Design an enzyme around this catalytic site. Sequence first.
Site, PDB file in Angstrom:
ATOM      1  N   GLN A  62       8.467 -25.966  45.766  1.00  0.00           N
ATOM      2  CA  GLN A  62       9.500 -26.621  46.563  1.00  0.00           C
ATOM      3  C   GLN A  62       8.948 -26.996  47.925  1.00  0.00           C
ATOM      4  O   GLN A  62       8.421 -26.145  48.645  1.00  0.00           O
ATOM      5  CB  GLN A  62      10.744 -25.753  46.755  1.00  0.00           C
ATOM      6  CG  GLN A  62      11.821 -26.560  47.490  1.00  0.00           C
ATOM      7  CD  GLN A  62      13.035 -25.739  47.851  1.00  0.00           C
ATOM      8  OE1 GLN A  62      12.965 -24.882  48.732  1.00  0.00           O
ATOM      9  NE2 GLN A  62      14.169 -26.009  47.190  1.00  0.00           N
ATOM     10  N   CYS A  92      18.728 -27.394  52.754  1.00  0.00           N
ATOM     11  CA  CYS A  92      18.597 -26.441  53.859  1.00  0.00           C
ATOM     12  C   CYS A  92      19.336 -26.934  55.101  1.00  0.00           C
ATOM     13  O   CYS A  92      19.007 -27.987  55.651  1.00  0.00           O
ATOM     14  CB  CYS A  92      17.126 -26.167  54.190  1.00  0.00           C
ATOM     15  SG  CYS A  92      16.862 -24.744  55.290  1.00  0.00           S
ATOM     16  N   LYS A 131      16.682 -30.314  44.870  1.00  0.00           N
ATOM     17  CA  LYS A 131      17.695 -29.262  45.018  1.00  0.00           C
ATOM     18  C   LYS A 131      18.566 -29.631  46.206  1.00  0.00           C
ATOM     19  O   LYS A 131      18.061 -29.920  47.307  1.00  0.00           O
ATOM     20  CB  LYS A 131      17.038 -27.879  45.226  1.00  0.00           C
ATOM     21  CG  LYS A 131      18.076 -26.731  45.401  1.00  0.00           C
ATOM     22  CD  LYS A 131      17.430 -25.331  45.162  1.00  0.00           C
ATOM     23  CE  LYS A 131      18.414 -24.177  45.379  1.00  0.00           C
ATOM     24  NZ  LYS A 131      18.782 -24.045  46.828  1.00  0.00           N
ATOM     25  N   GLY A 193      24.753 -20.997  42.363  1.00  0.00           N
ATOM     26  CA  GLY A 193      25.612 -20.450  43.376  1.00  0.00           C
ATOM     27  C   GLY A 193      26.484 -19.380  42.769  1.00  0.00           C
ATOM     28  O   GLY A 193      27.339 -19.679  41.938  1.00  0.00           O
ATOM     29  N   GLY A 214      19.670 -16.781  41.986  1.00  0.00           N
ATOM     30  CA  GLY A 214      18.857 -16.352  43.115  1.00  0.00           C
ATOM     31  C   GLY A 214      19.073 -14.887  43.461  1.00  0.00           C
ATOM     32  O   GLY A 214      18.340 -13.993  43.019  1.00  0.00           O
TER      33      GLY A 214
HETATM   34  C1  LIG Z   1      17.041 -14.993  51.142  1.00  0.00           C
HETATM   35  C2  LIG Z   1      17.298 -16.415  50.727  1.00  0.00           C
HETATM   36  C3  LIG Z   1      16.320 -17.377  50.908  1.00  0.00           C
HETATM   37  C4  LIG Z   1      16.584 -18.685  50.511  1.00  0.00           C
HETATM   38  N1  LIG Z   1      15.602 -19.644  50.649  1.00  0.00           N
HETATM   39  C5  LIG Z   1      15.752 -20.870  50.038  1.00  0.00           C
HETATM   40  C6  LIG Z   1      14.702 -21.777  49.963  1.00  0.00           C
HETATM   41  O1  LIG Z   1      13.576 -21.459  50.399  1.00  0.00           O
HETATM   42  N2  LIG Z   1      14.922 -23.010  49.377  1.00  0.00           N
HETATM   43  C7  LIG Z   1      16.166 -23.349  48.864  1.00  0.00           C
HETATM   44  O2  LIG Z   1      16.391 -24.440  48.349  1.00  0.00           O
HETATM   45  N3  LIG Z   1      17.194 -22.454  48.946  1.00  0.00           N
HETATM   46  C8  LIG Z   1      16.979 -21.224  49.516  1.00  0.00           C
HETATM   47  N4  LIG Z   1      18.015 -20.345  49.548  1.00  0.00           N
HETATM   48  C9  LIG Z   1      19.278 -20.793  48.900  1.00  0.00           C
HETATM   49  C10 LIG Z   1      19.095 -20.313  47.424  1.00  0.00           C
HETATM   50  O3  LIG Z   1      17.999 -20.960  46.742  1.00  0.00           O
HETATM   51  C11 LIG Z   1      20.309 -20.473  46.505  1.00  0.00           C
HETATM   52  O4  LIG Z   1      20.640 -21.859  46.408  1.00  0.00           O
HETATM   53  C12 LIG Z   1      21.507 -19.652  47.002  1.00  0.00           C
HETATM   54  O5  LIG Z   1      21.122 -18.324  47.305  1.00  0.00           O
HETATM   55  C13 LIG Z   1      22.667 -19.689  45.980  1.00  0.00           C
HETATM   56  O6  LIG Z   1      22.309 -19.142  44.714  1.00  0.00           O
HETATM   57  P1  LIG Z   1      22.594 -17.582  44.364  1.00  0.00           P
HETATM   58  O7  LIG Z   1      24.073 -17.308  44.575  1.00  0.00           O
HETATM   59  O8  LIG Z   1      22.265 -17.332  42.922  1.00  0.00           O
HETATM   60  O9  LIG Z   1      21.730 -16.719  45.222  1.00  0.00           O
HETATM   61  C14 LIG Z   1      17.791 -19.031  49.921  1.00  0.00           C
HETATM   62  C15 LIG Z   1      18.770 -18.068  49.736  1.00  0.00           C
HETATM   63  C16 LIG Z   1      18.510 -16.752  50.140  1.00  0.00           C
HETATM   64  C17 LIG Z   1      19.534 -15.677  49.940  1.00  0.00           C
END
Ligand SMILES: Cc1cc2nc3c(=O)[nH]c(=O)nc-3n(C[C@H](O)[C@H](O)[C@H](O)COP(=O)(O)O)c2cc1C
EC number: 1.3.1.-
Length: 307
Positions: A62, A92, A131, A193, A214
Amino acid sequence: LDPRLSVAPMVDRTDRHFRFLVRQVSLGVRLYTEMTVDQAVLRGNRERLLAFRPEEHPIALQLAGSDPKSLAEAARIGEAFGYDEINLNLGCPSEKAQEGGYGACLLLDLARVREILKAMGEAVRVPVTVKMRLGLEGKETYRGLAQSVEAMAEAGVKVFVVHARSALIPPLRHDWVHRLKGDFPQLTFVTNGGIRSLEEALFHLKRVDGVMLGRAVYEDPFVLEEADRRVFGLPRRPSRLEVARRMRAYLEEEVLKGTPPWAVLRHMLNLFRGRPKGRLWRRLLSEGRSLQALDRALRLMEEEVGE
Ligand SMILES: Cc1cc2nc3c(=O)[nH]c(=O)nc-3n(C[C@H](O)[C@H](O)[C@H](O)COP(=O)(O)O)c2cc1C
């Protein structure tokens, strides 16, 4: 590209050490690097930033950035390191992402996004994917989301990972991603999400092409225990002790290669979440932070479960 199941990119979490661990749980699941800024790829220590182990395939890099030629060159670099896919972060909303003019900020300039994706797609032979979020808080509309998807599809993108919450507490709208699939049957949509279990993922797999998990995976990697069987149709089922033994061998080699033991161990603390002696496992690794501590923790677990 099998879009059915992936682990979300997470800065400070999804480095090669945690990715290696997850790979031991599920052979099938697609892994994603932490968000990696194009400028860091161009100007940094590329081997240190990007090198990964062949076991980690399938894996996507990414990237984040705002300039077509810069992102295209960073994509070429990622392709040279063997990544199976280059994913563009369009979601982001962080303070950093705003000053740098990347991430969610870009959605406000579809023209620029289009030029970025065209440049990237022509630069490499592997798939370029996106994304993104549902939209920017306040003016989240389905029409707007669809208009964004259509534009990026004109630029050649086929795979859209949608974190189904607006950015800036706005609720999850997985139904919008389901709707996208209905409106753009020819494109591939992966919803993301708040998905906390494989059962929840399978619910969504009835509606969209893929699911990305995630936080649930970082909290408990064995949330993916049944993925290879139930999602990928593989006659494989990991055990926590087997994974731990494989991680021990990896740690031994990595420390000899110059990796600080905690860089690996900090991502292993949850391997026995909810299991007998789970808390002791965590304490032993956290206090010891060494191969010897992992060895002690292994012996206690092997005595606990048996054979
Ligand atoms: C600790 C952390 C770091 C994250 N870093 C990124 C990232 O580097 N790139 C990205 O697209 N999203 C990042 N996110 C957003 C996540 O990829 C993801 O879209 C979000 O946590 C929702 O999914 P989940 O509920 O399964 O965790 C991050 C989220 C968390 C909690």
